[PDB]
Structures are given as C-alpha cells and as structure tokens.
C-alpha cells in the first residue's frame, strides 16, 4: 500500500506500507527482506510494536521519517554501490522511534536503528535528518564489511564513514545532524565536515584527541577524516597542501571501496590513507588526478 504523512520537519511524503486486517502497518515488504518501523511508546523496550494507522495517512512524524529515510537509504546503497541492504543480502531494516522519554540520542545496536525524540530544546526527533538515519544504518554496513573496532583511530574511522555516507545521501551541505539540532538556531549542526573545529572536532592529525573518554575520542577524531573527505571532494588549500577536488560522486565511490574492501577491524588513519589511495588507483588509474588528490587530501590533514 501507499501511505502518506508528514516528517519531523512538517513535509508531506509517501512510502510503502502493508494492509493487515483493519489497518496498515508501517512495513515495506518490497525492499530486501523488508523495511519495518516500530514505536517504543516512550519506553526502552526494542523493537517495540510495529507502527499502525487506520487510513494510511500517518500522524507520526518521527516514524514517517525513520521509515521513509530507511527506504531511501536502501535505494541509495543499491543504486549507488550495488549493495542490497546492510549485509549485501537483503537484511531486514528495523527502526524504532519514540525510544525513551526526551532521549537525546540515536544509535545502531548491531541489529536495528533506534531513535530518541530529543528533549525539544537541543534536539528534536533524530530520524528527522536523513543524514542521521544514513549515519546509523552505515554502522551496520561497517559491521558487515571492514568491521572497524569502536576505539581509538579505528573507532574514529567507523564514525567518519557513517558521516561521509549519511551526508552524501542528502547532499544538502557539508553538515551532520543539522536538521534535528537546536531548532531555535539556523545553520549550526552537530558536526561540520568542511570546518570540523566549529564544533570542537580536530581537522588535522596534529590535534588528535588522545584521552580515554568516548572510547578514545571516536566522535571527536572523526573530524580529521571528514576533513580529508571534504578536501578530496571539494578541493582546497589546507596546511599548505593544495588538493584539487574531484567532486562528491568520485570521492564517495573511492571511500565506499576503501572502507568496505580494504580496511579491517584494527585499521588506523594511516591504513585509511593507503586504502583511499588504493581505491582511487583501482577506479581512475595509478597516476591519475584522482589518485593524486587522494594522497594530497591525507597530506593536508597530516596523516602520512
Ligand atoms: Ca491516519
Ligand atoms: Ca542534514
Ligand atoms: Ca539548529
Ligand atoms: Zn555513529
């Protein structure tokens, strides 16, 4: 069936649902093994209950966006990368919204995407930014490919790949989480990929966070890798190094191959530089403008 409804930002969209007895479930059986979206009813049991609606016009902005953006992310991976869901074999995509009460985060737990509502002040419902949905689902992609550990540089790479892909899905700007952060302030964000230090992330390896909090800085140090991706795609001169931009299309192919074919669970930033150079060589040639840009983007952020 074709359901309709407003997302967290008030925009009407359509998506696929399933008629089941007297009502419709928020369940799309046409993408892999399914896209299925649940409510946790403001408690913390997951997955919770499949969301239902009597007339297929939905009034659950968070669930509309969780469901729609998971279907769009499914379409994006298959269309862009030839990948069928998280495992490449059609894994069912399960999302739960209204997790907890005023809960200020969202996460991938090894099985499904779970989204808090936010407290209404700092955050609104987290599925409202397709780059956050993209971000969380890409944590499952990483689990099934490089399986990058979630500590230190490995864990920062894990984070950075989730931001590169989430951001690339929407393509609105160089920001992450901007649609759901601080609804009373325009143009800020959880992270910036073009200017990471705006939100207290380092943009160069010489300012790597080396403390133990946050699993050794995994949401901090991703700023360095996000900056390298930005320089590869957009180009720039940074720390004296000029990177000729190769555009998002080519950059995201290079990073996708790098992070799914070449990195492994213990990889650090140096290995990521090697993997990104290799993917650029695979795709454009050993001495191509693209392979040269890949190497310069890492020179620029001080990863040798
Ligand atoms: Ca209705
Ligand atoms: Ca966004
Ligand atoms: Ca804001
Ligand atoms: Zn993450």
Residue numbers in the entry: 1 to 304
Question: Which statements did the authors publish about this structure?
Answer:
The TLP Gentlyase, the neutral metalloprotease from Paenibacillus polymyxa (EC 3.4.24.28), is an extracellular metalloprotease that cleaves fibronectin, collagen IV and, to a lesser extent, collagen and has maximum activity at neutral pH. This enzyme is used to gently disperse mammalian cells and tissues and is widely applied in cell-culture procedures or for the isolation and tissue dissociation of primary cells. The Gentlyase metalloprotease structure shows the overall architecture of a typical TLP. The C-terminal and N-terminal domains are connected by a central α-helix containing several catalytically crucial residues.
Here, we report (i) a method that can be generally applied to identify suitable conditions to keep active TLP stable for crystallization and (ii) the structure of Gentlyase, the TLP of P. polymyxa, at 1.59 Å resolution in the absence of and at 1.76 Å resolution in the presence of phosphoramidon, the natural TLP inhibitor from Streptomyces tanashiensis. Sadly, the pair of Gentlyase structures described here do not help in clarifying the question of whether the domain movement upon inhibitor binding is a general feature of all Bacillus TLPs. The lack of domain movement observed for the Gentlyase metalloprotease can be explained by the dipeptide fortuitously bound to the active site in the uninhibited form. The same rationale was applied to explain the lack of movement originally observed for thermolysin, in which the un­inhibited crystals also showed electron density for a dipeptide. However, the observed electron density is likely to represent a mixture of proteolysis and autolysis products. Another possible explanation for the lack of domain movement observed in the Gentlyase structure is the loss of the double glycine motif that precedes the central helix and is close to the thermolysin-like protease hinge-bending axis reported by Holland et al.. Comparison with other TLPs showed that the marked calcium dependency of Gentlyase stability may arise from a partly degenerated calcium site Ca1–2 and a deletion near site Ca3.
